[PDB]
């Protein structure tokens, strides 16, 4: 299958073991902004669900399908690869909806649907939008979509912006300087200090922050889920040119994302931006190896290149330069191994 081709077996085992825990489904469910917005988007656009056929890609608990059933869906197909599918089925029976919600255990790209569907619902967004590579499973499910059918959500905007956080940057060398001592219980550890520094810089930092650290308006890279193909997400080139609103040392790029549910009645937004209330996605920051001085008015340009890997994530390559000075920096980061800092 397509999933097994692009995914390492062990990554897949671990991944669906994780979502098999009720505690993890719960964690997502009790994110009120996330779950609330999804419900609000499905019900306010009741015309899109009334007596229609729906596909829930990765139903988990079944929560989003129940929201579709609340909006008057005739049939809802609920696909889920983890053992959570069993628990989803139990909830379908207990809520008296076996006639309307059908739960299909298996990966969306390996199972077969009886019929095609009018609309597909899913919550496949990881942190920095793309982590987990579930967007590809989402797009792949359009093989079951009827022509002119809809996607909920319909688009996704990833936002990038430069930040100054002098303390975050210096903390990396503070931690790595554990190794810089000539007699740790008699042992000179200093030869590994450089290797410790490299390790910490490979980690994107998942936490939130005060918006005052942002030095320019975000640049967005848009994915239209109606138009895009799986292959569009194997290599994601995000070019940027920031018109700098503040002067200082730029230490990295801050990431967040929004998605839109473009319905018949109205358009509903779910944002994970640092201006909005905190979600379980937090935000993500990738440091440069070396900071860049920028003046207000300057242009900080470069590329964020996300290269998909078979561990359901991306290798992040970031190159950036201040156009007026020539000063430049870069970093290579491992999206699957982030440092969780708001812990």
């Amino acid at each position: 299958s397509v999933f097994s081709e692009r995914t390492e077996e062990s990554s897949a085992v671990q991944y669906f073991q994780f979502y098999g825990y009720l505690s993890q489904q719960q964690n997502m469910m009790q994110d009120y902004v996330r779950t609330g917005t999804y419900q609000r988007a499905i019900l306010q656009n009741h015309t899109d669900f009334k007596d229609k056929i729906v596909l829930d890609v990765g139903c988990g608990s079944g929560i989003l399908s129940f929201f579709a059933a609340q909006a008057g869906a005739r049939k809802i197909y609920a696909v889920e690869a983890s053992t959570m599918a069993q628990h989803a089925e139990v909830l379908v029976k207990s809520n008296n909806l076996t006639d309307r919600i059908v739960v299909i255990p298996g990966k969306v790209e390996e199972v077969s649907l009886p019929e095609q569907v009018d609309i597909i619902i899913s919550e496949p967004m990881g942190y920095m939008l793309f982590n987990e590579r579930m967007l590809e499973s989402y797009l792949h499910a359009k093989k079951y979509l009827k022509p002119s059918g809809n996607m909920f959500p319909t688009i996704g905007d990833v936002h990038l912006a430069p930040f100054t956080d002098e303390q975050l940057y210096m903390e990396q060398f503070t931690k790595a300087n554990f190794w810089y001592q000539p007699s740790f219980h008699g042992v000179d550890l200093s030869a590994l200090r450089g290797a410790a520094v490299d390790e910490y810089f490979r980690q994107p930092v998942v936490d939130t922050f005060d918006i005052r650290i942002l030095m320019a308006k975000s640049v967005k890279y848009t994915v239209n889920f109606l138009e895009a193909k799986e292959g569009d997400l194997h290599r994601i080139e995000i070019p940027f040119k920031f018109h700098m609103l503040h002067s200082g040392l730029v230490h990295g790029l801050a990431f967040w994302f929004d998605v839109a549910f473009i319905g018949s009645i109205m358009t509903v937004w779910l944002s994970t931006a640092p201006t909005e209330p905190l979600t379980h996605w937090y935000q993500v920051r990738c440091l440069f190896q070396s900071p860049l001085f920028a003046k207000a008015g300057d242009t900080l340009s470069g590329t964020c290149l996300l290269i998909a890997n078979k561990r359901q994530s991306y290798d992040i390559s970031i190159v950036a330069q201040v156009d007026q000075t020539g000063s430049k920096s870069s970093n290579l980061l491992d999206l699957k191994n982030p440092f969780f800092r708001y812990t």
């Binding site: 009790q30 994110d31 942190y127 379980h280 699957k336 812990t343």
Partner: peptide, 9 residues
């Protein structure tokens, strides 16, 4: 990653 979805308070 190991814990793809991070814990919310």
């Amino acid at each position: 990653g190991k814990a793809p979805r991070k814990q919310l308070a």
